[PDB]
Amino acid sequence: PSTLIRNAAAIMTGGRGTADDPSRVPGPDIRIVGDTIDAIGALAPRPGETIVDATDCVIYPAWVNTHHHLFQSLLKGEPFRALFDERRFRLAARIGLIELARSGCATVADHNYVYYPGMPFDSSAILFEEAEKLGLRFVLLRGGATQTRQLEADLPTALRPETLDAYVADIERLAARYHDASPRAMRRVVMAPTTVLYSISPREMRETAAVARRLGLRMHSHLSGKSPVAFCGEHDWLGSDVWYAHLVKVDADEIALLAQTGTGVAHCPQSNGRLPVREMADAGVPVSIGVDGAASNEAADMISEVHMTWLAQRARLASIAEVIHWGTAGGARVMGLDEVGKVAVGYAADIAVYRLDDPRYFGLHDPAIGPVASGGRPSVMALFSAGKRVVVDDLIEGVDIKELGGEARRVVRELLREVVV
Numbered sequence: 535p536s537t538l539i540r541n542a543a544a545i546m547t548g549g550r551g552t553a554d555d556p557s558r559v560p561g562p563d564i565r566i567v568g569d570t571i572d573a574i575g576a577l578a579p580r581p582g583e584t585i586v587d588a589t590d591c592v593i594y595p596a597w598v599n600t601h602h603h604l605f606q607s608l609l610k611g612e613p614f615r616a617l618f619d620e621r622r623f624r625l626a627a628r629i630g631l632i633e634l635a636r637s638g639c640a641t642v643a644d645h646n647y648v649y650y651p652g653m654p655f656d657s658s659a660i661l662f663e664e665a666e667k668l669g670l671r672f673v674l675l676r677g678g679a680t681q682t683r684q685l686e687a688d689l690p691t692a693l694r695p696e697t698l699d700a701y702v703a704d705i706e707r708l709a710a711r712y713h714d715a716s717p718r719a720m721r722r723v724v725m726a727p728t729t730v731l732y733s734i735s736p737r738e739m740r741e742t743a744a745v746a747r748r749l750g751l752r753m754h755s756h757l758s759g760k761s762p763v764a765f766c767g768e769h770d771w772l773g774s775d776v777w778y779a780h781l782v783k784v785d786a787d788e789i790a791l792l793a794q795t796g797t798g799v800a801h802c803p804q805s806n807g808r809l810p811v812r813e814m815a816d817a818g819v820p821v822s823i824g825v826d827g828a829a830s831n832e833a834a835d836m837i838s839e840v841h842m843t844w845l846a847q848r849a850r851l852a853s854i855a856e857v858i859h860w861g862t863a864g865g866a867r868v869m870g871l872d873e874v875g876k877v878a879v880g881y882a883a884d885i886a887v888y889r890l891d892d893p894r895y896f897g898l899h900d901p902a903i904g905p906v907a908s909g910g911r912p913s914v915m916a917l918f919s920a921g922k923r924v925v926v927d928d929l930i931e932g933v934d935i936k937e938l939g940g941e942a943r944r945v946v947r948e949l950l951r952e953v954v955v
C-alpha cells in the first residue's frame with residue numbers, strides 16, 4: 535500500500551503562500567503510504583511500489599466543496615421538489631457527485647433540505663451511500679425548517695415543515711450513526727437549517743445551536759431588530775463553529791464581526807450571479823468555495839467555480855494560489871477537516887493530477903495555472919481520496935456515462951410530464 539507519483543511539472547500546496555506556508559512547492563515526486571502523504575520532492579522508487587508517471591502533469595490538492603444542493607442536479611434548468619422519490623433523489627445525487635469528482639473535487643458538502651414528516655426514503659442514507667460508492671469524503675449539511683406559513687393545506691406532504699424536536703432527534707440519530715470527529719473523517723454531519731433567519735424561529739436558533747455544539751458539530755446556513763449578522767451573533771449563530779452561504783451585501787461592521795468571531799463563508803460566484811469577497815478575506819474571515827444546486831448554477835463543478843472566482847477577483851485588479859487556497863485548505867478548515875486540503879507531508883492523501891492534453895493549455899508559460907485560468911475542464915489522469923485512486927484518466931469505477939446520460943434524459947421527461955399535473 536505505497537504509491538509514488540513521479541515527475542510532476544508543478545505542485546500547488548494549497549498553502550496561504552507565506553514563507554511559513556508556501557503555496558507552490560517546487561519539488562517533483564510524491565510518496566503516499568496508506569491514506570497519508572509521506573514525502574515530497576526528489577524520491578527514488580521502491581521495489582513493488584505503485585508508480586504513476588505524472589510527467590507533464592500538474593498536481594493540486596483535491597477540491598473541497600463547502601456548499602451544494604445535490605437534488606437540484608435534476609432541476610438544472612430553473613427553480614418540482616415534491617416530485618422527488620427514492621430512485622430520483624438517488625440519481626440527482628449521483629449525477630452531481632460524479633460531475634464533481636471529475637472536476638478534481640474529493641470532499642463534497644451538500645446542504646440537503648429534502649426532509650418532511652413521513653418521507654418514505656432516507657435522504658441522508660442515500661447521500662452517504664452514493665458518496666462512498668465513489669470513494670469521496672462526504673459532509674452532510676442537514677437542512678430544514680420548522681416554519682413556512684405558505685400555510686399547510688395548500689402545501690403537499692413533501693413541503694411541510696418538521697417539528698423542532700423531530701429535527702433535533704434526527705440529528706442526534708445522524709450524529710451517532712455517521713459523524714466521525716477526526717480531522718480526516720470520511721463522514722461528517724452538521725446542523726444546517728436552510729435559511730436560518732426564516733426556516734426557524736430565533737428562540738429555536740439558540741437551542742438549535744446548543745444541540746450542535748453539545749454534539750460537537752458545526753453549523754451552516756444560507757444567510758439572506760437590526761443587522762442580519764449582528765442578529766445571528768445575538769442568537770448563538772457565529773463563531774469559527776459556523777459558516778454561511780449566499781451572504782452577498784455585507785456591512786463593514788458586519789465584516790468585522792465575521793472576522794472577530796472566525797465565522798466562515800461559502801463563496802458561490804456562478805450561483806450568486808443569478809442574484810463581496812476580497813474584503814472579508816482581507817478582514818481575515820475564512821473563505822471557502824462552493825457551487826450550489828444546478829438549479830442556480832448550471833455549471834456545478836469546482837473547476838467552473840474556481841475559474842469564475844479567479845476572474846471576478848481579477849476584475850478588482852487575487853492570485854491563482856490565493857484562489858487555490860480558498861478551494862482547498864480554506865474550505866477544509868471551515869468544515870473542521872484540518873488534516874485535509876493541503877499537499878504537504880502528514881496530511882490526508884487527497885490529490886488531483888491533471889493532464890493538460892487539451893489545446894487550451896498549449897502555450898502556457900506557467901502550465902500550473904491552467905486548471906484555474908484556462909476554462910474548460912482539465913483531464914484528471916488521477917484523483918486520490920484518502921490515498922485511493924478514485925479516478926484514472928477521467929474514468930470512475932462503476933460509472934457508465936452514456937448510461938447515466940440516458941437515465942437522466944428519461945427522468946427529466948417524466949419530471950416535465952408530471953409537473954403539468
Ligand SMILES: [Zn+2]
Nearest residue numbers: 603756779826
Ligand atoms: Zn444554496
